[PDB]
Motif scaffolding. Structure first.
Motif, short mmCIF file in Angstrom:
data_model
loop_
_atom_site.label_atom_id
_atom_site.label_comp_id
_atom_site.label_asym_id
_atom_site.label_seq_id
_atom_site.Cartn_x
_atom_site.Cartn_y
_atom_site.Cartn_z
N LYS A 1 -127.84 -8.81 39.84
CA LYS A 1 -127.17 -9.99 39.32
C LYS A 1 -127.90 -10.62 38.15
N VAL A 2 -128.99 -10.01 37.69
CA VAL A 2 -129.81 -10.62 36.63
C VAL A 2 -129.07 -10.79 35.30
N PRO A 3 -128.39 -9.77 34.74
CA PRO A 3 -127.77 -9.99 33.42
C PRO A 3 -126.62 -11.00 33.42
N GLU A 4 -125.79 -10.99 34.46
CA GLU A 4 -124.71 -11.97 34.54
C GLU A 4 -125.24 -13.37 34.79
N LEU A 5 -126.30 -13.52 35.58
CA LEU A 5 -126.93 -14.83 35.73
C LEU A 5 -127.56 -15.29 34.42
N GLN A 6 -128.11 -14.35 33.64
CA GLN A 6 -128.67 -14.69 32.34
C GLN A 6 -127.61 -15.20 31.38
N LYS A 7 -126.50 -14.46 31.24
CA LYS A 7 -125.45 -14.95 30.36
C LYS A 7 -124.74 -16.17 30.95
N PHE A 8 -124.87 -16.40 32.26
CA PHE A 8 -124.46 -17.67 32.84
C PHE A 8 -125.36 -18.81 32.41
N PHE A 9 -126.65 -18.54 32.19
CA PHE A 9 -127.56 -19.63 31.83
C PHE A 9 -127.51 -19.94 30.34
N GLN A 10 -127.65 -18.93 29.49
CA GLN A 10 -127.73 -19.16 28.04
C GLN A 10 -126.33 -19.29 27.45
N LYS A 11 -125.71 -20.44 27.70
CA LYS A 11 -124.53 -20.86 26.95
C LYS A 11 -124.88 -21.51 25.62
N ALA A 12 -126.17 -21.80 25.38
CA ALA A 12 -126.65 -22.54 24.21
C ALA A 12 -125.96 -23.89 24.08
N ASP A 13 -125.65 -24.52 25.21
CA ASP A 13 -124.98 -25.81 25.25
C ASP A 13 -125.92 -27.00 25.12
N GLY A 14 -127.24 -26.77 25.14
CA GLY A 14 -128.20 -27.81 24.88
C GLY A 14 -128.61 -28.64 26.08
N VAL A 15 -127.96 -28.47 27.23
CA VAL A 15 -128.35 -29.20 28.43
C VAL A 15 -129.63 -28.52 28.92
N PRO A 16 -130.59 -29.25 29.49
CA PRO A 16 -131.85 -28.63 29.89
C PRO A 16 -131.70 -27.66 31.06
N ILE A 17 -132.80 -26.95 31.32
CA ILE A 17 -132.80 -25.77 32.18
C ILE A 17 -132.59 -26.12 33.65
N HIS A 18 -132.85 -27.36 34.05
CA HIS A 18 -132.61 -27.74 35.43
C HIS A 18 -131.16 -28.13 35.69
N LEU A 19 -130.32 -28.10 34.66
CA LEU A 19 -128.91 -28.39 34.84
C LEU A 19 -128.06 -27.19 34.42
N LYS A 20 -128.52 -25.98 34.77
CA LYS A 20 -127.75 -24.78 34.51
C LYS A 20 -126.75 -24.45 35.61
N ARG A 21 -126.91 -25.02 36.80
CA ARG A 21 -126.05 -24.62 37.91
C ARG A 21 -124.74 -25.41 37.92
N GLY A 22 -124.80 -26.72 37.70
CA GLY A 22 -123.58 -27.49 37.68
C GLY A 22 -123.58 -28.76 38.51
N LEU A 23 -122.76 -28.80 39.55
CA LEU A 23 -122.71 -29.91 40.49
C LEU A 23 -123.77 -29.85 41.61
N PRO A 24 -124.05 -28.70 42.25
CA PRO A 24 -125.09 -28.72 43.30
C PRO A 24 -126.48 -29.06 42.80
N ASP A 25 -126.85 -28.63 41.60
CA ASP A 25 -128.20 -28.95 41.14
C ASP A 25 -128.32 -30.41 40.72
N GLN A 26 -127.27 -31.01 40.15
CA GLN A 26 -127.32 -32.45 39.91
C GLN A 26 -127.22 -33.22 41.22
N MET A 27 -126.55 -32.65 42.22
CA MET A 27 -126.54 -33.22 43.57
C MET A 27 -127.96 -33.33 44.12
N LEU A 28 -128.70 -32.22 44.10
CA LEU A 28 -130.08 -32.26 44.57
C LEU A 28 -130.92 -33.13 43.65
#
Ligand SMILES: CCCCCCCCCCCCCCCCCC(=O)OCC(COC(=O)CCCCCCCCCCCCCCCCC)OC(=O)CCCCCCCCCCCCCCCCC
Ligand code: HEA
Ligand code: HEA
Ligand SMILES: CCCCCCCCCCCCCCCCCC(=O)OC[C@H](COP(=O)(O)OCCN)OC(=O)CCCCCCCCCCCCCCCCC
Ligand SMILES: CCCCCCCCCCCCCCCCCC(=O)OC[C@H](COP(=O)(O)OCCN)OC(=O)CCCCCCCCCCCCCCCCC
Ligand SMILES: CCCCCCCCCCCCCCCCCC(=O)OC[C@H](COP(=O)(O)OCCN)OC(=O)CCCCCCCCCCCCCCCCC
Ligand SMILES: CCCCCCCCCCCCCCCCCC(=O)OC[C@H](COP(=O)(O)OCCN)OC(=O)CCCCCCCCCCCCCCCCC
Ligand SMILES: CCCCCCCCCCCCCCCCCC(=O)OC[C@H](COP(=O)(O)OCCN)OC(=O)CCCCCCCCCCCCCCCCC
Ligand code: CUA
Ligand SMILES: [Cu+2]
Ligand code: NA
Lengths: 103, 93, 48, 72, 85, 54, 227, 44, 514, 46, 139
Positions: free
Chosen positions: F1-28
């Motif tokens: 699952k590494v390459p698909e997780l990688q292209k899931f992370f690098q959207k180049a959207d500028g949000v920092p690396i701890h907010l790559k997951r979405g709602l559950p990571d901002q939940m925590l």
């Protein structure tokens, strides 16, 4: 030794492709040495400043010799009194009568 | 087997630096530069992308103080104490 | 054409008189016990 | 009419060596002044104390004050 | 755009979380040793465990999913590891 | 699952690396900031009551 | 005893302390040598109008610039090792006396024959006799005889103290559960004043040691006079 | 180090205000506690 | 936005700015504590009544100015400000533990104030001597709050040291070695080594004293076989390496500022300079029992340790002669920071010489825990180290703010410290010669002269730090900018302008092929 | 992107001399007065 | 905006010839005197000499390295706030400090004076040495 020191300095200042930047570098690293410069070295510097037209840098290195004379002010009369033919065939005066020795 | 290799696993900045390594290029300063030439006709070339660059010359052998200065895109400028020449060139894409 | 030609001597004179006056005041006018050396001029008397 | 040739080079060198010679001589002068002031006077004052000093007689002449807790 | 071969670390609140978590843990140890409390201890232990948990999850995320770990940085990491040990 | 997780992370959207997951990571994220701030407030008030004599 | 406007140290009583202050004064004119050097150098160094900012070579000062500090510190240290030899010299144990740091005060013991133990406290300022020293006078001064090697055997009960007599110049650290031996000799009668010398609570300034040099005949008369 | 003229050249009075403010903001707190020390010493 | 830039920071410049402001915090708290001490000691008698509170404020004095500003500027803030700006590093290798170090410092500060707030009060002094800090004399929480505050400060220093060594080796360009770079690299390198090789002993000490107190072991209690000399040995095995941590970054910055304001293009004796630095770092471990000259240790150990203190006094003299050699023969422009440098070299010299006098063994036997020891370390670290601190602080203030500091007020201040600290701490010299022990609130009557004149000198130090608050205010008020700085050719840190931008060294430094 | 410049790279705004004066004086007043309030608190407790 | 790019003027005797001029902008008559300077050197007078010097570089050493009264005003400020410090001492002596202990009365200090003279405290050099025990008066 001092003889080849002054020889390489006068050849550096009498090379025909001298310009203001590298003579500035050479004069600054000459000032960095612990020596009042030789009147022949000052003579070569004045020929170079004649060659590329720097009155103000020439009188600046003259007053540099003046402040490098130190606590005793007999060195600068010696330097100028060998420099009299050079000044009056380049036409340059020194600050002690062109008015920069004072405030 | 089962252990992955670099060309399938390492990604991103690893990919650029590893492909640059296997072509033998250093675009991100992993290694000290080459082509030392202080003369007039062959100055010291510095690759860049910008107008502006830091150099630090150890311009005498086994030196204490590094002589740092700024390169601009333009005419070659030299060390103020030793005399090694420098140009900037914009191709480090 | 600066601050130190005349304001400098004014400040040094005024600070001089002010500081010496207040330090003679602190040394003498309050009269705090310095517990100076009682040699020379200070005399004791008998006790049991 | 003319001037002799003074020193161009080594001026600060001879200045610094004569001044560090002055530093050494003024340091030994400061130490000798401190010695002659206080140091051997300690040895002396101990000597003229202890060549004729009698500690037991010293004990009586502050013992007539009647101060000692062990000597009433 | 960056030109150096070093990982530019983006801003993180994880230092603040770890700092106040360690403060909570120290306060728990002294509060237990002098006033017999358990709840602040439970809070402190859980907050350290989670703090290092998603801290190191962020570390792995920037490491293997981003590829910022240039071998210069990697040998610097090995230097940090040998100095820690 | 590494390459698909990688292209899931690098959207180049500028949000920092701890907010790559979405709602559950901002939940925590939000629950950890809430619990750590509540913990440090409870530490400071506990130290203040410890300061005051009975 | 310390006097007001005291410039130097206390005047020595013990012969070991006269040796110690001789070595002290040795270190003092040595430090005045080097302080005079640095002041004269810095003065005639800042008052110079000459510049030399060239590459002056540095690999030519090592031998002298390292052998002069080496020799000056080694002739400093040789009297230090010699005086440490007179620290650990062989004793002739003429007398022993034990002391304990009890909780913010002192206790003294003479247990050689007819065992005696007593406690010493601080005489308060309001309860001071007219004509006594502040913070020093003690209702039970420790008393020792003339010119006898006597070993202080120090210990403490519940917190470490330091038996400190600067008028004999010895301070030795009374660790609990650990007695240390410190020999003393003297040659002059009278009262000698000191303190304890580590932090040990909320009356730390309020615990002195006052020591009374008497002849040994009157000392044994005193010892018979308590009990 | 060559430097440009003060962007905000504090006037004679302005400098005094800042100087006094620092002195007052520091002396008052200490003096206040020291002034009430006599009542403080008293144990009630 | 503010919570992202300054709370959540991962840049060394703003972490250093936060370090500087926290250091100003702790320095003012510490000078207020010293003024409490000095006002209590101004007159014979007791100003505060009981001196348990005096012990609490003197140990707070000691903790706050040994652990809370000296590393934060002198190692922390100055380090993470300048080390990238002179190496060429874009940033920390380890900025999240730079942030560990900084953001666990205020929890340590708050636990120290909580120890003060504890009813018992941690009146144990700088050192945490059992059984004074034991279960009977100090039965309370204050000692445990101090222990955990020192735990947090210790792990702060550990993670800072790991970051500093990793940056000081890893961030370096590959062609330049460790001997091609100026003295910040070697200074913070050797001090971070001393942190890494000293602090775990302190952490071990506070842990087993902590379990001696709370959950009942017998490591230091002699009633069940413990020994206070264990904590003594290990704590001084920490203490003197931490001492040389407190003295070496000052050496590096003072050599840099002397080279700058003497006009020297290169500091003289650079190989000898760094050799003296590594000699001090390598030898500072085995000189720790110079405080042990009167506890009851063997005379062979005492002789070995006093010989070792002579041997460690040697490269300090090499350092002083190197400083004078750097100052030799230059265009001596009278900057205030150069005056700070002259004050540092002279007064640190005489303080270290008094320390040599102390390390004479029988002189320590007559002068242990005495005000002469106070006179030692109060010329050496209370004023030598902070004179280095203000020298750097007014030297790189445009690098820290973008604005200049007023030289007239600065050198008038160097004068006001000069007279104040001389008339403060030379009387202590007189007091230690007279011979009273340390940690005293009430003194015998013969010490009134020197006690009062040192009190006046301390109030001189008060109006001096008032001039600090004032001149920082007026510098921020005038906010005048530079136009040119000297010696930026040999100074990398001044090349990005005043102040350096957010992203510095995006393109790393080009280096000669050689 | 983060915006830089002289003085604005500091956590307190330098937009006005009087407001910066007020903030610095209250902050440093609290800093100077904190251990005074401490020692006051223990002499209240004792 | 940024000016560390172009080399910057800084007049000091250590580096007595800076790489860059002082006034880079040059007017029409200033260009005329510069080309006359490039011409023969025998037709230049003192005022244009000093003006060309002052327009190419800023200062000369014999008028810049002058001892001003900055040391005077800073020692004046130093001992001026020393005076304010003494005022602070007056305030705190009046309000903060309480009474002296009774151990400093003239009769009482006479009591201890007779005490340590009777004890011959540090009688070698320190205190009792300056006293005579024969005529009972200070030496
Ligand atoms: C961004 C736009 C403005 C946002 C609001 C700014 C004011 C409130 C604030 O959050 O302000 C920010 C905070 C930052 O402080 C902290 O966070 C305290 C941490 C402990 O300011 C303080 O609390 C007070 C600081 C007072 C001045 C201190 C001067 C120190 C001088 C010596 C060091 C110079 C270093 C130069 C480099
Ligand atoms: C930065 C802080 C610092 C520094 C550099 C030093 C440096 C030294 N210290 Fe100190 N010391 C402390 C901080 C420091 N100390 C503190 C805080 C304590 C208190 C601990 C406690 O509370 O117990 C202490 C205590 C302390 C004691 C404890 C006394 C006691 O038991 O009560 C001793 C004694 O050995 C000592 C010795 C030394 C020595 C020999 C040096 C040397 O390194 C000095 C070197 C520096 C010099 C400047 C050397 C000068 C020499 C020259 C310049 C050469 C020229 C001279 C000649 C040619 C003769 N120190
Ligand atoms: C760096 C550490 C440091 C500093 C500055 C000081 C400073 C001072 N100390 Fe210090 N002192 C200690 C460390 C320090 N002390 C230690 C470790 C002890 C031992 C404790 C013990 O006994 O257990 C001690 C003990 C001690 C005693 C104990 C004696 C006793 O009780 O028997 C006394 C009393 O005279 C004293 C007095 C003073 C005075 C009057 C100052 C004055 O110099 C105050 C002036 C201070 C300053 C002016 C600070 C400068 C800082 C700034 C201006 C901020 C800079 C920040 C930026 C620029 C961002 N100190
Ligand atoms: C002779 C032996 C001696 O003790 O000389 C003292 C001093 C030289 O010192 P020295 O002991 O040799 O070693 C350095 C440590 N003082 O030597 C001196 O102090 C010299 C004393 C005699 C010369 C005095 C000159 C004074 C000039 C004014
Ligand atoms: C500053 C110099 C370097 C630091 C020196 C520190 C030691 C010191 O000053 O000691 C005081 C010294 C010795 O005192 P002493 O002369 O023995 O007093 C009794 C007889 N007058 O006393 C003297 O040296 C005299 C008084 C101080 C002079 C300065
Ligand atoms: C007293 C407080 C108010 C002083 C007002 C005043 O006279 O201001 C003028 C001047 C401003 O300072 P200035 O001369 O610009 O700076 C020193 C140069 N380095 O002020 C000064 O230089 C200080 C004047 C102090 C007078 C006492
Ligand atoms: C409790 C302290 C835990 C410290 C820790 O685990 O630090 C994590 C740190 C993360 O790696 P770091 O290099 O900071 O990542 C950003 C740049 N890649 O890890 C590292 O930097 C490497 C390991 C450091 C260990 C320090 C432990 C204390
Ligand atoms: C109590 C001690 C108080 C010390 C106060 C020191 C104030 C120094 C003020 C100052 O800046 O002095 C520099 C000045 C020379 O500087 P300047 O005029 O630029 O030189 C050109 C020709 N001399 O004047 C001097 O250099 C002479 C005074 C130097 C004082 C040095 C003190 C070092 C400690
Ligand atoms: Cu007993 Cu201090
Ligand atoms: Cu040590
Ligand atoms: Na007191």
């Amino acid at each position: 030794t001092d003889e080849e020191f002054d020889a390489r300095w006068v050849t550096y200042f009498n090379k025909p492709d001298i310009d203001a930047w590298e003579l500035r570098k050479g004069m600054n690293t000459l000032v960095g040495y612990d020596l009042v410069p030789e009147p022949k070295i000052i003579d070569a510097a004045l020929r170079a400043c004649r060659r590329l037209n720097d009155f103000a840098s020439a009188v600046r290195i003259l007053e540099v010799v003046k402040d490098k004379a130190g606590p005793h002010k007999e060195i600068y009369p010696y330097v100028i009194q060998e420099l009299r033919p050079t000044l009056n065939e380049l036409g340059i005066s020194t600050p002690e009568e062109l008015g920069l020795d004072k405030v | 087997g089962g252990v992955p290799t670099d060309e399938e696993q390492a990604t991103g900045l690893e990919r650029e630096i590893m492909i640059a390594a296997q072509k033998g290029l250093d675009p991100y300063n992993m290694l000290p530069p080459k082509a030392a030439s202080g003369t007039k006709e062959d100055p010291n070339l510095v690759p860049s992308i910008s107008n502006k660059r830091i150099v630090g010359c150890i311009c005498e052998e086994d030196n204490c103080t590094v002589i740092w200065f700024w390169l601009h895109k333009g005419e070659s400028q030299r060390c103020p104490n030793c005399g090694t020449h420098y140009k900037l060139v914009p191709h480090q894409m | 054409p600066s601050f130190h030609d005349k304001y400098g001597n004014a400040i040094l004179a005024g600070g001089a008189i002010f500081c010496v006056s207040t330090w003679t005041y602190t040394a003498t006018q309050i009269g705090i016990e310095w517990n100076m050396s009682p040699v020379g001029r200070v005399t004791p008397k008998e006790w049991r | 009419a003319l001037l002799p040739k003074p020193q161009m080079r080594g001026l600060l060198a001879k200045r610094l060596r004569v001044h560090i010679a002055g530093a050494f001589i003024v340091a030994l002068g400061v130490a000798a002044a401190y010695k002659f002031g206080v140091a051997e006077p300690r040895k002396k004052a101990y000597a003229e104390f202890y060549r004729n000093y009698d500690s037991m007689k010293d004990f009586e002449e502050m013992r007539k004050a009647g101060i000692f807790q062990s000597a009433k | 755009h960056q030109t150096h071969a070093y990982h530019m670390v983006n801003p993180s609140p994880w230092p603040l979380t770890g700092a106040f978590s360690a403060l909570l843990l120290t306060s728990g140890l002294v509060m237990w040793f002098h006033y017999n409390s358990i709840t602040l201890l439970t809070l402190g232990l859980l907050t350290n465990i989670l703090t290092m948990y998603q801290w190191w999850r962020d570390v792995i995320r920037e490491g293997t999913y981003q590829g910022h770990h240039t071998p210069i940085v990697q040998k610097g990491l090995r230097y940090g590891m040998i100095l820690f040990i | 699952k590494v390459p698909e997780l990688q292209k899931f992370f690098q959207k180049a959207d500028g949000v920092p690396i701890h907010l790559k997951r979405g709602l559950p990571d901002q939940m925590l994220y939000r629950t950890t900031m809430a619990l750590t701030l509540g913990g440090t407030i409870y530490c400071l008030i506990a130290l203040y009551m410890a300061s005051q004599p009975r | 005893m310390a006097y007001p406007f005291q410039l130097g140290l206390q005047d020595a009583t013990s012969p070991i302390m006269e040796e110690l202050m001789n070595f002290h004064d040795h270190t003092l004119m040595i430090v005045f040598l080097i302080s005079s050097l640095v002041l004269y150098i810095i003065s005639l160094m800042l008052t110079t109008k000459l510049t030399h900012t060239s590459t002056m070579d540095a690999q030519e000062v090592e031998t002298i610039w390292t052998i002069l500090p080496a020799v000056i510190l080694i002739m400093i240290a040789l009297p230090s090792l010699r005086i440490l030899y007179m620290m650990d010299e062989i004793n002739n144990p003429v007398l022993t006396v034990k002391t304990m740091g009890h909780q913010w005060y002192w206790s003294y013991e003479y247990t050689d024959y007819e065992d005696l133990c007593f406690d010493s406290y601080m005489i308060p300022t309001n309860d001071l006799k007219p004509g006594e020293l502040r913070l020093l006078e003690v209702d039970n001064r420790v008393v020792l005889p003339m010119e006898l090697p006597i070993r202080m055997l120090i210990s403490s009960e519940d917190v470490l103290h330091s038996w400190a007599v600067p008028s004999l110049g010895l301070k030795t650290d009374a660790i609990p559960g650990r007695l240390n031996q410190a020999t003393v000799t003297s040659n002059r009668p009278g009262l000698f004043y000191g303190q304890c010398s580590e932090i040990c609570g909320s009356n730390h300034s309020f615990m002195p040691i006052v020591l009374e040099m008497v002849p040994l005949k009157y000392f044994e008369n005193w010892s018979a006079s308590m009990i | 180090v060559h430097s440009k003229p003060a962007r905000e050249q504090l006037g004679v009075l302005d400098i005094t205000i800042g100087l006094t403010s620092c002195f007052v903001c520091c002396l008052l707190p200490a003096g206040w506690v020291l002034s009430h020390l006599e009542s403080y010493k008293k144990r009630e | 936005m503010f919570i992202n830039r300054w709370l959540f920071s991962t840049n060394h410049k703003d972490i250093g700015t936060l370090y500087l402001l926290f250091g100003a915090w702790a320095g003012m708290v510490g000078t207020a504590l010293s003024i409490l001490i000095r006002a209590e000691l101004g007159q014979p008698g007791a100003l505060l009544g009981d001196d348990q509170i005096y012990n609490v404020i003197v140990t707070a004095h000691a903790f706050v100015m040994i652990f809370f500003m000296v590393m934060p500027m002198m190692i922390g803030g100055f380090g993470n400000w300048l080390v990238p700006l002179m190496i060429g590093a874009p940033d920390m290798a380890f900025p999240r533990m730079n942030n560990m170090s900084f953001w666990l410092l205020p929890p340590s500060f708050l636990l120290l104030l909580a120890s003060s707030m504890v009813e018992a009060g941690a009146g144990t002094g700088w050192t945490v001597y059992p059984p004074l800090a034991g279960n009977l004399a100090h039965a309370g929480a204050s000692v445990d709050l101090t222990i955990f505050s020192l735990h947090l400060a210790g792990v702060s220093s550990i993670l800072g040291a790991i970051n500093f060594i990793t940056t000081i080796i890893n961030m370096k360009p590959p062609a330049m070695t460790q001997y091609q770079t100026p003295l910040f690299v070697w200074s913070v390198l050797i001090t971070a080594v001393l942190l890494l090789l000293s602090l775990p002993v302190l952490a071990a000490g506070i842990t087993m004293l902590l379990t001696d107190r709370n959950l009942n072991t017998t490591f230091f209690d002699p009633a069940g076989g413990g020994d206070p000399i264990l904590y003594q040995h290990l704590f001084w095995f920490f203490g003197h390496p931490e001492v040389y941590i407190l003295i070496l970054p000052g050496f590096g910055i003072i050599s840099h500022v002397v080279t700058y304001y003497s006009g020297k293009k290169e500091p003289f004796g650079y190989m000898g300079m760094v050799w003296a630095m590594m000699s001090i770092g390598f030898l500072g471990f085995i000189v720790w029992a110079h405080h042990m000259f009167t506890v009851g240790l063997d005379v062979d150990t005492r002789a070995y340790f006093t010989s070792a203190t002579m041997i460690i006094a040697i490269p300090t003299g090499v350092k002083v002669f190197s400083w004078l050699a750097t100052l030799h023969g230059g265009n001596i422009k009278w900057s205030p920071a150069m005056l700070w440098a002259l004050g540092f070299i002279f007064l640190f010299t005489v303080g270290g010489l008094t320390g040599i006098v102390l390390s004479n063994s029988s002189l320590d036997i007559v002068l242990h825990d005495t005000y002469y020891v106070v006179a030692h370390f109060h010329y050496v670290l209370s004023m030598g180290a902070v004179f280095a601190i203000m020298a750097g602080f007014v030297h790189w203030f445009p690098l820290f703010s973008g604005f200049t500091l007023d030289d007239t007020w600065a050198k008038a201040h160097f004068a006001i410290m000069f007279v104040g600290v001389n008339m403060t701490f030379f009387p202590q010299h007189f007091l230690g010669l007279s011979g009273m022990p340390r940690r005293y609130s009430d003194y015998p009557d013969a010490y009134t002269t020197w006690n009062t004149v040192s009190s006046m000198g301390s109030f001189i130090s008060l109006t001096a730090v008032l001039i600090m608050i004032f001149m920082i205010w007026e510098a921020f008020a005038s906010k005048r900018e530079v136009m040119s700085v000297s010696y930026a050719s040999t100074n990398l840190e001044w090349l990005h302008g005043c102040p350096p931008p957010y992203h510095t060294f995006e393109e790393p430094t080009y280096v000669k092929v050689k | 992107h983060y915006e830089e410049g002289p003085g604005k790279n500091l956590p307190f705004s330098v937009e006005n001399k009087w407001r910066l004066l007020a903030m610095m004086t209250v902050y440093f007043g609290s800093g100077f007065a904190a251990p005074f309030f401490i020692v006051r608190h223990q002499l209240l407790k004792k | 905006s940024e000016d560390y790019a172009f080399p910057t003027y800084a007049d000091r005797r250590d580096y007595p010839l800076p790489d860059v001029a002082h006034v880079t902008m040059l007017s029409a008559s200033q260009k005329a005197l510069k080309e006359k300077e490039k011409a023969d050197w025998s037709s230049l007078s003192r005022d244009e000499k000093v003006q060309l010097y002052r327009i190419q570089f800023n200062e000369s050493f014999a008028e810049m390295n002058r001892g001003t009264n900055e040391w005077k005003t800073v020692v004046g400020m130093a001992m001026f706030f020393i005076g304010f410090t003494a005022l602070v001492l007056i305030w705190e002596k009046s309000y903060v400090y309480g009474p002296i202990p009774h151990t400093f009365d003239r009769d009482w200090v006479a009591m201890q004076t007779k005490r340590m003279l009777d004890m011959k405290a540090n009688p070698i050099q320190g205190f009792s040495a300056k006293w005579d025990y024969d005529k009972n008066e200070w030496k």
